[PDB]
């Protein structure tokens, strides 16, 4: 399964979570930004690696980073 990391540059704009096609990211409470929220990656087993999450990231060099790793039938997007 791929690896998804969140960095404290998160501004809690939720654009990553609402762009994930496989429900990998979610918004959790935080105290490091104005919005009081930070993205989390608790379901990386469903991560497919499409990187839509970091295409919607407005922070300078990203706050969500997807590191491709071992492959799985879920991560390979295999309907068969």
């Amino acid at each position: 399964s791929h690896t998804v990391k969140i960095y404290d540059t998160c501004i809690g704009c939720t654009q990553c979570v609402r762009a994930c096609p496989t429900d990998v990211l979610e918004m959790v409470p935080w105290d490091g930004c104005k919005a009081g929220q930070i993205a989390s990656a608790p379901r990386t087993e469903d991560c497919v690696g499409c990187k839509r999450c970091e295409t919607a990231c407005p922070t300078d060099f990203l706050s969500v980073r997807v590191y491709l790793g071992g492959e799985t039938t879920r991560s390979l997007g295999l309907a068969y």
Binding site: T9, I11, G32, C33, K34, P58, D60, F61
Partner: protein, 61 residues
């Protein structure tokens, strides 16, 4: 630094590193990156603004 001040970006992983920007607002709360800087050159993603920390910006004389 304050609103309208000119600062140099010291963050290395920045599309505006070593460049000068205009401070839009410095937040007075306990946020990690309070300084908001606006630039004339859009980055590779199209944005022209970003939040920076207090130690990642250096005011121009």
């Amino acid at each position: 630094i304050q609103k309208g001040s000119t600062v140099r970006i010291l963050r290395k992983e920045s599309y505006w590193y070593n460049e000068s920007g205009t401070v839009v607002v410095v937040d007075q709360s306990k946020v990690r990156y309070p300084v908001l800087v606006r630039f004339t050159k859009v980055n590779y993603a199209g944005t022209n603004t970003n939040n920076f920390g207090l130690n990642e910006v250096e005011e121009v004389v």
